[PDB]
C-alpha cells in the first residue's frame, strides 16, 4: 500500500531503542537478540551464543535499568551488516548513572531481520 526504502543509521538507531527498552522491560529476554557464535563482552572476557549470554545477563542482576543514550553512530559494514557505536548513561538497581560505551555489529539472519553478532560494552568509570 505505501512503500519506501531503509537505512543503516536508521536500523542502528532502531535497534538501539529496542535493545535498551527490552533491557528495562525484560533483561531475562535480552538474549533472544543474539544468534550462534555471537560475542557478549560486558563490564573482562567474552561469552558465546544464546544460552551462555542468557546466563551472563542473568548474573548481572539487571533490575530497573534506565538509560540515557546521547549519541548513536551506525554505518554499514561487511556482510551488508551494520556496526553501531552508542555513547550514553546506564543506571541499575536505582543506583546512579554511569557513562558507557557500547559497540554492536549487526548481521542479517529471513527477509529484513537482523541479529547481534558482537557486543562490547564498558563504562567510563573503570577505564580512564
Amino acid at each position: 500500500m505505501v512503500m519506501e526504502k531503509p537505512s543503516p543509521l536508521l536500523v542502528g538507531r532502531e535497534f538501539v531503542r529496542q535493545y535498551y527498552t527490552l533491557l528495562n522491560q525484560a533483561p531475562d529476554m535480552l538474549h533472544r537478540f543474539y544468534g550462534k557464535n555471537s560475542s557478549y563482552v560486558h563490564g573482562a572476557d567474552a561469552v558465546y551464543g544464546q544460552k551462555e549470554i542468557h546466563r551472563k545477563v542473568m548474573s548481572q542482576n539487571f533490575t530497573n535499568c534506565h538509560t540515557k543514550i546521547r549519541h548513536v553512530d551506525a554505518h554499514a559494514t561487511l556482510n551488508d551488516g551494520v556496526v553501531v557505536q552508542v555513547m550514553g548513561l546506564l543506571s541499575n538497581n536505582n543506583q546512579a548513572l554511569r557513562r558507557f560505551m557500547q559497540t554492536f555489529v549487526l548481521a542479517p539472519e529471513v527477509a529484513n531481520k537482523f541479529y547481534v553478532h558482537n557486543d562490547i560494552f564498558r563504562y567510563q568509570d573503570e577505564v580512564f
Binding site: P6, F15, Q18, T21, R32, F33, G35, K113, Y115, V116
Partner: peptide, 12 residues
Amino acid sequence: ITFGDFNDGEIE
C-alpha cells in the same frame, strides 16, 4: 525493523 528472535509487537 524486526530483530533477532522477536515477533513484531512484543518488541515494544
